[PDB]
Structure 1
Amino acid sequence: DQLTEEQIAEFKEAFSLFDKDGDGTITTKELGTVMRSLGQNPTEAELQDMINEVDADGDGTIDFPEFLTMMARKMKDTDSEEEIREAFRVFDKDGNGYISAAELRHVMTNLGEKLTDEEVDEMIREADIDGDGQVNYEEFVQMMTAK
């Protein structure tokens, strides 16, 4: 019961990356494309269940308001313990305990945002507390709790 301007901004950014055609609806093809690039393999039946969960009007696809609710369930309900480690493994593929600028940029590119290499290195230094030029799991959760 509030809804901030920053909140809507975060959702809108994610929604634009999902909807490749920007028609306002997310099909199983679009939803599956994002998850497939994140190192996951969800089937047609699996992707459909995700859409039906937030299907307010039951049109078969994910609309703008339906997507807002979907993100509110994961980013504002779940993800506390044994769930952040799974997300960390998505960025750090080799699992060395450190997320380099190359790994972060790779995941972002798969999402849809093809940022520059220099921009990603600026993000790394932001979460870099020990000054090693990388982001470990300890620094990952630290930045995940902050803006």
Structure 2
Amino acid sequence: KDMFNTKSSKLRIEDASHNARKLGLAPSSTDEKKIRDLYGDSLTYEQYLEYLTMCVHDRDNMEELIKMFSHFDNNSSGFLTKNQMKNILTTWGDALTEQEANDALNAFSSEDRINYKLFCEDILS
């Protein structure tokens, strides 16, 4: 069975989001709020397919992703340290846990000094 009919009873937004990730999309709390604000806590099939379209984010690219990290790179050198990126990722936005942030940073590189453009390029795939 498909990802929607496995858990349907309507499907909980939170589970729709997980399915979106398995399909290679990247929903944020903004998309969850949008889909909630017009269809409630649970979506019909048709509502859920709108949500997936909502989660395509075809404006996602390296130069859009790096904006916040650039703010912290004063001399626009191109790098930030793991711990810098961890603090950023765990304080602002839809904050990750320390563990989640470190796991992403460790998977991408074994060095402390991280090219955040290449890190943003890599997490897009």
Give the TM-score of the pair, scaled to structure 2: 0.49
| Structure 1 or 2: more strand by fraction | 2
Q: Which has the higher contact order (CA 8 A, sep 6+)?
A: 2
Give the TM-score of the pair, scaled to structure 1: 0.44
